[PDB]
């Protein structure tokens, strides 16, 4: 799995599953922008947990 990180292609660890994208997860008085590799999806509003390569665009 070789999906993106802020404009750089980066392979994941071979134990790690599908990656994701998020313009959310507020956590404070703020609205974060996250993108990276992952192992657990929590798709409610924008967590695009797509298991295809180069999916986060």
Residue ranges binding other proteins (CB under 8 A): 5-8, 10-13, 15-16, 27-30, 32-34, 36-37
Gaps in the chain after residue (C–N beyond 2.5 Å): none
Shortest distance, CB of residue 41 to other proteins, whole angstroms?
14
Complex with other proteins: residue 8 or 57, whichever CB lies closer: 8
Q: Closest Cα partner for 7 from 28, 31, 33?
A: 33
Complex with other proteins: residue 23 or 52, whichever CB lies closer: 23
CA angle 51, 12, 41 (to 5 degrees): 40
Complex with other proteins: residue 30 or 44, whichever CB lies closer: 30
């Amino acid at each position: 799995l070789k999906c993106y990180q802020h404009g750089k292609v980066v392979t994941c660890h071979r134990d790690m599953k599908f990656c994701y994208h998020n313009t959310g997860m507020p956590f404070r008085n703020l609205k974060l922008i996250l993108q990276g590799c992952s192992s657990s999806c929590s798709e409610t509003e924008n967590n695009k947990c797509c298991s295809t390569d180069r999916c986060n665009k």
